[PDB]
Design a protein around this ligand. Structure first.
Ligand SMILES: Nc1ncnc2c1ncn2[C@@H]1O[C@H](COP(=O)(O)OP(=O)(O)O)[C@@H](O)[C@H]1O
Ligand SMILES: Nc1ncnc2c1ncn2[C@@H]1O[C@H](COP(=O)(O)OP(=O)(O)O)[C@@H](O)[C@H]1O
Ligand code: SF4
Lengths: 259, 259
């Protein structure tokens, strides 16, 4: 009976979630964020449509993300991206305590307790370990970022990328091609390279029980598997992975719409 | 009467120096890293020719640089790049105490005392502040790395690049173009951006009196000027700037050839 709207406006995309009584997801949406493109707005329409409801049907609207204020007038209230991820993770996995969120342009590991963000470490300046790292690599390899996972899974040889930087690592990848190294192998290498950076931030926080991966890159099971190897613990993820930030907002909305 | 050979084999180029009695430069050479694995070799021939002498005439040969361990057989002893720069700087500027060396793929600030490396700070992992940063920018701007200095000198408006990263700053530059911002201005901005990183390392060491800029990027007076503004002290440089590492090797050679 009470419908709420969670809006996660990131730097790459804008995700939306609408849930009934804060217990079930009725609809979600995702729209690329282009300059001028007005995609966060579009995504809102997208959800409302998918759900067959009007903005006036939402009890409370909560926005989060990089441009969580670009639609200030839309959201009743805005909230930290760390908070929503913690809240959302908790809705999907009750025993979460550690949340690894990789999105374009940034990474962040969050320690969660009672759907809240206890502590966290995040990278906002280095393109390394971000989905942007994976883009720059998929381009040189001439492959689709959403294929990397599938390809790297075929690797038979370990190929390391000693360069920590995206720029230097780019040359490495180019050079590994000059040596006739297979792409499948270079990819699995790029994945461990990303895992390595995440693991780097990860340790300043500590991997607690029931680790979950969130964000768009979450889909890349190549990357996630590289993470399980590094941290040596199960890394969980679900289809809703990239809609976590939004899901968190919707949960905080339904909460604000009860107090 | 005693001729020595200094060979600085970098990642970008291979420089060579030959001096008589460790007091005067008789000849120098510079050869890129074209595909072949004989550019360092080629440069040696180049110098010997320019000088009109043969490898035998060289009393002692000392190699330095990224591929130092590659001239084992050609050279007689190898030495730290920090040491040669300090030694070489001292030969060019007696009162040096601080040496800023920007080359492709790395930056490093050296404190010098009696032709020796007292302390130093260096960047080897981040492409930011390196000549590689300038490359990635010259490409997007569609200009020649050796023109940047000349162009930026015409800027009339200050345009900042808030991004510290080469990858993110790359997009910025692209975006500053979308806003119709002049290249001349974007360049001067890129220069200060580089200066900022150098100054970053610089402070962990301390700018002492008589600062000198070394390395290929040394030529870029756009960059060097950005450095004088930041540190607020004179930054010296000479034509031999990029041959400093080699010059240092030749000086250590003539020294080894006297003890
Ligand atoms: N199928 C896929 N496989 C791999 N990566 C993907 C896939 N779909 C999206 N991604 C990526 O995951 C990231 C998700 O970004 P996201 O978290 O939505 O961005 P932001 O934090 O800016 O909102 C991007 O780098 C995007 O390209
Ligand atoms: N005329 C020039 N103007 C600006 N930059 C230059 C010029 N000539 C060379 N450079 C650059 O200066 C740097 C010199 O690199 P160098 O110190 O020789 O490399 P390495 O440290 O790998 O041996 C490179 O980034 C190169 O492109
Ligand atoms: S290490 Fe590379 S990817 Fe990271 S901030 Fe530096 S230039 Fe950017």
């Amino acid at each position: 009976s009470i419908y709420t709207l969670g809006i996660d406006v990131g730097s790459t995309a804008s995700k939306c979630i609408i849930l009934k009584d804060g217990k079930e997801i009725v609809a979600k949406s995702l729209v690329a964020v282009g300059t001028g493109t007005s995609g966060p707005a579009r995504s809102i329409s997208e959800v409302l449509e998918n759900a067959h409801m009007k903005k006036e049907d939402m009890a409370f609207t909560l926005a989060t993300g990089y441009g969580r204020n670009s639609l200030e007038g839309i959201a009743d209230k805005q909230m930290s991206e760390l908070s929503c991820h913690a809240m959302g993770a908790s809705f999907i996995w009750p025993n979460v305590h550690t949340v690894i969120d990789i999105g374009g342009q940034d990474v962040k590991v969050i320690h969660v307790e009672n759907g809240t963000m206890t502590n966290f470490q995040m990278n906002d300046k280095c393109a390394a370990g971000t989905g942007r790292f994976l883009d720059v690599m998929a381009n040189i390899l001439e492959v689709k970022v959403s294929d990397l996972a599938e390809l790297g899974a075929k690797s038979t040889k370990r190929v390391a990328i000693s360069s920590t930087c995206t720029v230097f690592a780019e040359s490495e990848v180019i050079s590994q091609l000059s040596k006739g190294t297979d792409k499948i192998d270079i990819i699995a290498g790029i994945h461990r390279s990303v895992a390595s950076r995440v693991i780097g931030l990860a340790n300043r926080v500590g991997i607690v029980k029931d680790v979950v991966m969130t964000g768009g890159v979450a889909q890349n099971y190549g990357v996630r598997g590289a993470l399980e190897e590094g941290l040596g613990v199960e890394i969980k993820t679900s289809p809703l992975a990239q809609y976590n930030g939004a899901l968190g907002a919707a949960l905080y909305a339904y909460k604000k719409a009860a107090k």
